[model samples]
Target: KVFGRCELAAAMKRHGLDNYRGYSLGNWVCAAKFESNFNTQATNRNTDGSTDYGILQINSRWWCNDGRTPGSRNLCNIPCSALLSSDITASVNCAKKIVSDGNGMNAWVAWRNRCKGTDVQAWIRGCRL
Candidate 1:
């Protein structure tokens, strides 16, 4: 499905969210639905006319360089983009990091109560090691 930087971030943000704990998928889907309607290119405008762009609605371009500039590395980077590229393990890992960074998941939860559902265990499903 190959998504851009923003799309992958949104997926990880949704997937790694722990609001629902044991039911993280619900929280993930809930946040994914709310934030961008699951749209990777989703961009929202602030009352001040500033914009929150991409799937996770991240506005941290100041932290990196990707759009509206030349030769800038995407804030989330190729790994993040690779996550966006499909519904795979990489996306999960990316989301974990994004959340662990105290930026991605935590911040999204702050944006929505459903995102803050709680119950980290519910968020994960068993996968082979």
Candidate 2:
């Protein structure tokens, strides 16, 4: 496991993501909770034969390449396997790029469906960032 909510909040803060690109740390943490429960190794096969990778559930269609996945756009120019590791820098960097591409946190369905317009402060409640 990468981190619990509190620890994740501290890490995100240290990474300068508490309010990066108009998105809040709470939003990121909330989405991560629902996406992978902070597990870096998380992967999910989608109905369309694509896969979501790592803590952010980045789609194979556009962010990373799994050798078996044909025609992967791999915008992040990294292997999907790279995301499934304890080191979160690559994942965080790629996610920042995604947000910069105008998708923002809306790139994550978990954020759109669960965190959008919700009070996400509980995600970092009592965390000493």
Candidate 3:
């Protein structure tokens, strides 16, 4: 399911993403907008054969094991399929893992390409927090 902007913001915040690793709910919201448009089942396969999954587009090459990505780190210790559901528990937990890592939010290229250094506050401004 694809989330509306406010819906996604509330969801991420509910999962403790707000102010995580010094990034705000707006930052997470903005990144999701560009990364997967808040779609719970979004997937994208890179040319190098790695696949991304779920709302935050967690990478199969390093985060989740798709059983298809060669030499996957599987750092999240979850099957990639676990990310393809409206039940975002696994996805958000894995996303928190990613954020807690050294790379922080830069784990997502979409965040660097779009959300970084931008005023993401507007992403959550109208949401009833």
CA deviation > 4 Å runs, candidate 2: none
lDDT of 1 by residue, 39-128 (tens): 655656455434454445553332223245434445454322343333545434444445555454555743356656455333333421
Best by TM-score: 3
- Give the clash count for model 1: 13
**Candidate 1 versus the native: TM-score?**
0.46
User: How many backbone collisions does model 2 have?
Assistant: 0
lDDT of each: 0.46, 0.87, 0.90
Model 3, range 28-68, lDDT digits (tens) per residue? 99998999988989999999899999988999998998889
Model 1 lDDT, residue 3, Cα: 48
Task: Quote model 2's TM-score.
Answer: 0.94
Give lDDT tens digits, candidate 2, residues 1-129: 678889888877777777899888999899899999999999999987889999889889888888767777999999999988787887888898898887788889989999999999888889888
lDDT head-to-head 1 vs 3, winner: 3
Report lDDT (Cα) of residue 2, candidate 3.
88
Per-candidate TM-scores read 0.46, 0.94, 0.96
Task: Please give the lDDT score at residue 15 for candidate 1.
Answer: 50
Give the higher-TM-score candidate: 1 or 3. Answer: 3
